Point group: C2
């Protein structure tokens, strides 16, 4: 028209190859069609270093203010990255920071095409990973205890009452880690999962190791059971779907023999691992949608994958790459859809439906980046480099006048 | 006559796997060997009598004699304490034993020519090299019902206290602390780099060192140091690589790989990933599992669970198609070593057999339900466990 927006999208930029691709998507796919309103936050590793990570806090506060963010893939610096970039320090994960500030559950679902069959034989139906976005080792405290010692966790409440437990007592160099979660957050996580399963009419599976983690993981098991029995058991029976709880090593065994079609609830760490397992097995890592659904009414759409470092070095050498931009696209269309829905601007939502359908129909016709070409049946017609792929969807958008 | 020095140590299970220990003893080893066993009933009812002492006694016996054999046990949750006659939710006997010995648990699929793996690209076996020590298997935990300041605290022998804050919260919270030692991580690294030269397989290792900058990153640092300084050149010379990446990345790669590497694993990942690997290759029962201590003791075990759900179902009319192949290969691995150290080559050449026969059997189309569901061409007969052992005797 161009399509009009009422509220800005909060836009969080990122690193490496996905940072290169981000402007191509906007320039070729969105800006010809939508008069795009965003509040831009650069969460590139250099901007985070330049502002001592403050820009991450700003972006998260902007998501809370406007309601919906879209996030590009970022580097979390370790010792290698600090060296590579000249960093002041090993900054904390911007994802960990944003998710802590929002709370919620990250729903991760493969983006399926008809010409790619899953790596796992039995899998017919999509598997959705519902990842708790809050706590555990994404807000860790750690110590390199270079002389060993008595290793403990200590809680001191607001009246000054302390409780202490000994992890171990050793007399040699050791490492110590502590994590937390909250009762309230685990509750929001169970509810978000139970709500998602009902809405989508799929079973819900959850698993921890509550036989080893007798108070921590067992707390998650307890809360899911009580919330389920007190609030969802009957809606579940009415909708004809089931909650299934088991141990985590066991759930992954069953997952290898399952036909899929369930919501796999996961603790924060497990959901990181298993969401990559699931994306990879269904297709490739780029073929996955990811949305953080917060209990406070915010949404953050993101890619689940990383910044494709190896393709980036190729790009810096002046090479074209066939980097799959699909998860970045779905982040944009996932965010713009939610924005238009919140705003009562359904032509924005309509555009999003189209750009998603065009992406799928392009790949299914045999026009695709190299990750998908390696695995499609029948063989691709054309193995497009990133820019060509994005131009091809651009062309299809135009051939509707959109 | 029957074959014959030192008692291989013996720990015994719970539920359905206990029920199948006699049958392997009686039918597959007793008629053909002098069976010296130091018996420790690690059943849930026994540990709840002896206050779990039987587990410690039991693990000292393995320290004392040298080589153990363990049946799948149960580890108790509040559910198991409502269920059984139980004083406490006792700690995992596996955790207990593996704390006391240390090591790396190597876990490999028991492969068989008529089962296609679940993962289409897997053409070679994948070994899991699971660190047996520390992390959350030796945890401290508090339910902070009034919230507060949540911390880890280290006091060294000279009274130096170091504190780090996990979070301060104004609401109920759960709190967990865990540890490892630099020494045990070093041993685990070396254990894995050796397995890889001694099997001439590549080594893959993975943690989340970008999130856990002092804990996981220490593992990462220790692997790359020990490999730069002790194995870089032994690896180029053997034609093999050490590969390090992020845990989420490695598992993404595992689904597109052809297999045939050593997957080095932290303690918790090794637990999850060996079940994934076992199950994708065939079934959970189709897996070997040996604790190799750096001290160095051995513990040859199941890996899978006591088969609850299958136990009741035996508590009526004996519907038993349970796959014993893993209980069996714990013995054939354990004697293959109990007699490898007892000098006698008259036990390596027998063991080489009790297993090779188990295979030939399955490969010829006589096998348990789990296997019959997934083999091709279709199974000739679906034998039940009781009748599966029989077939493996007796010349
Ligand atoms: Mg991830
Ligand atoms: Mg990457
Ligand atoms: Mg396990």
């Amino acid at each position: 028209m161009k399509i009009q927006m009422k509220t800005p999208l909060v836009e969080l930029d990122g690193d490496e190859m996905t940072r290169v691709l981000w402007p191509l998507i906007k320039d070729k796919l969105l800006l010809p069609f939508i008069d795009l309103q965003t509040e831009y936050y650069d969460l590139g590793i250099e901007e985070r270093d330049r502002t001592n990570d403050q820009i991450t806090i700003d972006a998260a506060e902007a998501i809370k203010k406007y309601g919906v963010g879209v996030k590009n893939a970022t580097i979390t610096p370790n010792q290698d990255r600090v060296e590579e970039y000249g960093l002041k320090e090993q900054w904390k994960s911007p994802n960990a920071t944003v998710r802590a500030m929002l709370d919620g559950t990250v729903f991760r679902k493969p983006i399926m095409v008809k010409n790619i069959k899953p790596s796992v034989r039995s899998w017919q139906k999509p598997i959705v990973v519902g990842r708790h976005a809050y706590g555990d080792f994404y807000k860790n405290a750690e110590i390199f205890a270079e002389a060993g010692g008595k290793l403990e966790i200590v809680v001191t409440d607001k009246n000054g009452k302390e409780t202490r437990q000994t992890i171990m007592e050793v007399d040699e160099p050791a490492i110590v880690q502590g994590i937390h979660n909250t009762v309230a957050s685990i509750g929001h996580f169970a509810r978000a999962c139970f709500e998602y399963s009902l809405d989508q009419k799929i079973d819900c599976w959850f698993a921890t190791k509550d036989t080893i983690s007798k108070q921590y993981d067992q707390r998650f098991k307890i809360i899911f059971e009580e919330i389920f029995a007190q609030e969802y058991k009957e809606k579940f029976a009415a909708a004809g779907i089931e909650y299934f709880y088991t141990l985590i090593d066991d759930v992954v065994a069953r997952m290898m023999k399952t036909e899929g079609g369930m919501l796999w609830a996961c603790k924060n760490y497990d959901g990181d691992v298993m969401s990559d397992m699931v994306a990879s097995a269904f297709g490739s890592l780029a073929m996955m949608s990811s949305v953080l659904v917060s209990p406070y009414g915010y949404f953050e759409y993101e890619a689940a994958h990383g910044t494709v470092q190896r393709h980036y070095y190729q790009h810096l050498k002046g090479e074209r790459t066939s980097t799959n931009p699909v998860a970045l696209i779905y982040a944009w269309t996932g965010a713009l859809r939610k924005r238009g829905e919140l705003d009562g601007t359904p032509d924005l939502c309509a555009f999003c439906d189209s750009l998603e359908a065009i992406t799928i129909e392009c790949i299914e016709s045999g026009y695709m980046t190299g990750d998908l070409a390696r695995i499609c049946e029948p063989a691709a017609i054309k193995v497009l480099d990133s820019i060509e792929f994005i131009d091809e969807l651009g062309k299809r958008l135009q051939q509707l006048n959109k």
